[PDB]
Write a protein that binds this DNA or RNA. Structure first.
Ligand SMILES: [Zn+2]
Lengths: 213, 54, 191, 100, 64
RNA sequence: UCAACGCCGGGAACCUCACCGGGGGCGACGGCAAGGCCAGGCUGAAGGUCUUGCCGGCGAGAGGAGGUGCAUGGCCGCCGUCAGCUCGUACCGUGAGGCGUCCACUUAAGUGUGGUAACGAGCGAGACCCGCGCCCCCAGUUGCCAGUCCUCCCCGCUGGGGAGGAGGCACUCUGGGGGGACCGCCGGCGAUAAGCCGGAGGAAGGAGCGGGCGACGGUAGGUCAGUAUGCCCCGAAACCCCCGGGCUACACGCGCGCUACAAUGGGCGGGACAAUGGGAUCCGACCCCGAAAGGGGAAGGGAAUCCCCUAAACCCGCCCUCAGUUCGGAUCGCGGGCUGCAACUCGCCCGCGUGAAGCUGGAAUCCCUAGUACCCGCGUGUCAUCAUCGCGCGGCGAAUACGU
């Protein structure tokens, strides 16, 4: 059971969930620095206010974005890890409380196992899971599969989606839980282990793109 | 002879309600003491005071 | 409670209006009004040839509350002024013409000019049915100004419909008139 | 010692009329009135299908009848009743008066 | 679309050809002047006219 | 085919009814008694008909849920919430016809700015109507209770917390009248024109948001089984009434859905939190019976006064720990009830047992740009009883793109 000093937690300082700071966190990719919101907050919940405006996602805290990714059902209309993941009544869709708690437990585990700040961990994981791709372009009548570069905002979306999907994968119809899976995924991607769905797909995407240059 | 010509006084059922304008039986608006078929009501509503207000 | 007999009154008024529109066709029926005085039911009947209404009136006074159940009814008979601006009576007039045996282009243009003379900004008549042969067609005769769509359409324009019953079948007559005391929003007048 | 007046109408013209009438009465005379008080409007919605047949896409007509409601308390003087009961009460308005 | 329509623009140009200097470069003054001079019962048309008149005045006064 | 298939408001026990079996009625008008009944019989049951007596003195019209929607009217869907469709005078052509209605830029838009054998008008779009969100004035009950006064009760540590009833309209709310937003200011891009993107300020920002009204036309689109109607057809009948069956039949192919294939969970016990609407033989608080479904009394309420009404998802603790299982819940047996004249065919609810497929789903394909989509339950329509449906209501609440 949760102890009472954790069930009834009262924050005193401005801190993510009242527990983890941001001033000791440092980004290094100059492309992603201006899109990783590290503002000091207590509750990452924006209530869908920044969606209408085109670039309104750069004003949302990373933790809120991750929570919103984790708030999902899995993989419909496409296969992930080999198989459709359709839950449809036991899914956390429109339930932000559970995603909040999942992320909290994952951060606790990460801190326990690493002795560092889980936000620094997540930042390095994003940096290492963001891909630098190919598409189809017509130079007049004829079409070729070309290689094009990617923008930071789409990079971030890609990385967050892939981390959340890795967790949903490793927690599928198995004894493991979603929090433990997310922590595993994050540590793996941060230290560059091919055990990670996200690092794997990053490498695969760059590999293919290199071909069609 | 003269008895097997008139209908029983039903109290419930589709055969207990008519439309006073058309004589239909089934799809009768029942709302607020009104006894009219959907067709007749849609024809004579404004003359009773209903409007669009949408 | 409230609407039980509110709506009772509305429904019976509508049904009596229908009975009268069907039984006072030769006279020119224009409307109806009912007011239950403590003495009994005041029943105002508009018309354009009050002479036709009048022992007929006695039979009405009795049958009304013999069948529909009013109480203490006595009937008045007024005469419409400027009946050439009410689409109802014009529709019935034209239907009676077509039944008499006049040709429809003639009748329509006659009615159009006779309406536009006595005052109107716009008129539209639509005839539909078996006018030329056994395959049905529709034809409209228009003049002036109208407001087919929008709220002013309901607010200002008068509309009427009637049925001409010939030996071959039914011809549908639709009439729409605009009065001269009207004005639209963008129709400004600058100081 | 107070009389209560309930006014109900589908038109607000008659309501404004009657209420300004009562206000002028009770002001020219020495007698107190509380109000008028607007009660919540009562609307009757009937939604039905347009088509007389069953073919075609389904479309619906929404018909609405609105009823406005006002309340007044007039203090029940003698001249009050005598000068109130005799007012032009149109047919598009329903009035109900009681004692308290 | 923010495209002012026929009678709006015409009435602006006419009320401006007439009563020229009774309008200036502020929407509020122009609005009340329009209300005084014209028989309009809606606020949207009035405000659009007043804005178009503000624009006319700006461009005439200090340019082409 | 889109535009048929939870559509004909089509949730059919009788009625509805139009189908099947069997009975009984039925001649407006016109010229060559009818009928009511005690007992018994035929009969599913019947003065329907026979015994018994007594009382009483031929063709048409109506009607038709019969045929024709390829004879019609009226209404509805689709092209299409498309931006198009016409007229006068002049001009070009022998003429059918053309121009205007075209070119450039420009909008959700034949919406606008310039040029031109065209100059001017009209219908549609817009304007118009309804609701949401912000501020001001008026109003204070059946709505509200903060500050005021009096009582009463409780806790620990007299500091706190509750309940009344006086007395008030401050707050909330209700509903009438007014204001406010206009690319208006500033930046850029655009013919210096019409205009485009962005910044502030601001309740709200780029027809603010969401709806109603859907032009001229056409589709031999659907509806004679909603009513109205031409022709054709049916009189003891295809007309009008009663009884019983059927539309609920099932080797199968399809559309739309509900429940699941479990831990992003199942169960038990505790803790929270709405709105829309409706209500006389109707809603029924409160008390008592009953294990449950349900039963007996019954205050009040014609509805800002009473009722339907302490919603579920959510939170806490305990059991289960990846299994065809404490998943899943079809099918069947015994029993207990409600509605109703009648519950077998063919209704709904409750308890104990029983415990089938199903371990994420190929080819293919659907819906969705923000309080939107996904998830959760509630009201109302139909309705004596019956909601996996239609029309609406709130609760929790994202991801991506500002394009082609
Ligand atoms: Zn009807």
């Amino acid at each position: 059971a949760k102890p009472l000093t954790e069930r009834f937690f009262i924050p005193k300082e401005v801190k993510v969930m009242g527990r983890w700071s941001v001033e000791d966190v440092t980004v290094e990719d100059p492309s992603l620095k201006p899109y990783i919101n590290l503002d000091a907050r207590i509750l990452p919940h924006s209530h869908g206010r920044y969606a209408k405006k085109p670039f309104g996602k750069a004003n949302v805290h990373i933790v809120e974005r991750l929570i919103n990714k984790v708030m999902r059902s899995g993989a419909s209309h496409y296969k992930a890890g080999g198989h459709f993941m359709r839950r449809e009544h036991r899914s956390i869709m429109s339930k932000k409380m559970k995603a909040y708690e999942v992320v909290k437990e994952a951060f606790m585990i990460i801190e326990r196992r690493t002795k560092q700040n889980p936000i620094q961990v997540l930042v390095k994981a994003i940096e290492n899971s963001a891909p630098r791709d190919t598409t189809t372009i017509a130079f007049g009548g004829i079409r070729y599969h070309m290689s094009v570069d990617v923008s930071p905002l789409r990079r971030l979306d890609i990385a967050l989606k892939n981390i959340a999907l890795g967790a949903s994968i490793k927690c599928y119809r198995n004894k493991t839980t979603y929090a433990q899976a997310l922590a595993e995924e994050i540590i793996a991607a941060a230290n560059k282990d091919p055990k990670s769905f996200a690092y794997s797909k990053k490498e695969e995407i760059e590999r293919i793109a290199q071909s069609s240059r | 002879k003269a008895d097997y010509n008139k209908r029983k006084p039903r109290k419930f059922g589709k055969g207990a309600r008519r439309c006073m304008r058309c004589g239909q039986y089934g799809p009768i608006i029942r709302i607020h003491g009104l006894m009219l078929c959907r067709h007749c009501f849609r024809e004579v509503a404004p003359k009773l005071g209903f409007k669009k207000y949408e | 409670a409230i609407e039980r007999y509110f709506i009772k009154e509305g429904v019976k008024e509508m049904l009596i209006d229908e009975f009268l529109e069907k039984e006072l066709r030769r006279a020119g029926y224009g409307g109806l009004d009912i007011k239950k005085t403590p003495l009994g039911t005041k029943v105002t009947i508009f018309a354009a040839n009050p002479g036709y209404v009048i022992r007929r009136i006695r039979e009405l006074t009795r049958i009304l509350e013999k069948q529909f159940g009013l109480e203490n009814p006595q009937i008045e008979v007024e005469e419409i002024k400027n009946p050439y601006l009410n689409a109802k009576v014009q529709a019935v007039r034209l239907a009676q013409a077509l039944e008499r045996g006049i040709h429809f282009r003639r009748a329509a243009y006659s009615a159009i000019r006779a309406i536009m003379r006595n005052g109107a900004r716009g008129v539209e008549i639509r005839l539909s049915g078996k006018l030329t042969g056994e395959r049905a067609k529709s034809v409209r005769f228009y003049q002036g100004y109208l407001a087919k769509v929008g709220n002013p359409a309901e607010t200002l324009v008068s509309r009427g419909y009637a049925q001409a019953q010939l030996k071959l079948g039914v011809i549908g007559v639709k009439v729409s008139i605009m009065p001269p005391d009207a004005k639209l929003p963008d129709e400004i007048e600058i100081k | 010692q107070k009389a209560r007046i309930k006014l109900a109408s589908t038109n607000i013209k008659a309501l404004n009329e009657v209420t300004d009438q009562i206000k002028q009465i009770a002001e020219r005379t020495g007698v107190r009135m509380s109000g008028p008080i607007p009660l919540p409007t009562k609307r009757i919605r009937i939604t039905t299908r347009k088509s007389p047949d069953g073919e075609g896409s389904a479309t619906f007509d929404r018909f609405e009848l609105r009823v406005h409601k006002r309340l007044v308390d007039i203090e029940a003087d003698e001249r009050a009743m005598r000068q109130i009961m005799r007012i032009r009460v149109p047919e598009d308005v329903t009035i109900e008066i009681e004692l308290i | 679309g923010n495209i002012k329509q026929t009678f709006i623009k015409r009435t602006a140009r006419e009320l401006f050809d007439r009563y020229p200097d009774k309008f200036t470069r502020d929407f509020e003054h122009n609005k009340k002047m329009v209300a005084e001079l014209t028989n309009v019962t809606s606020k949207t048309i009035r405000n659009r006219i007043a804005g178009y008149i503000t624009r006319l005045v700006r461009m005439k006064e200090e340019g082409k």
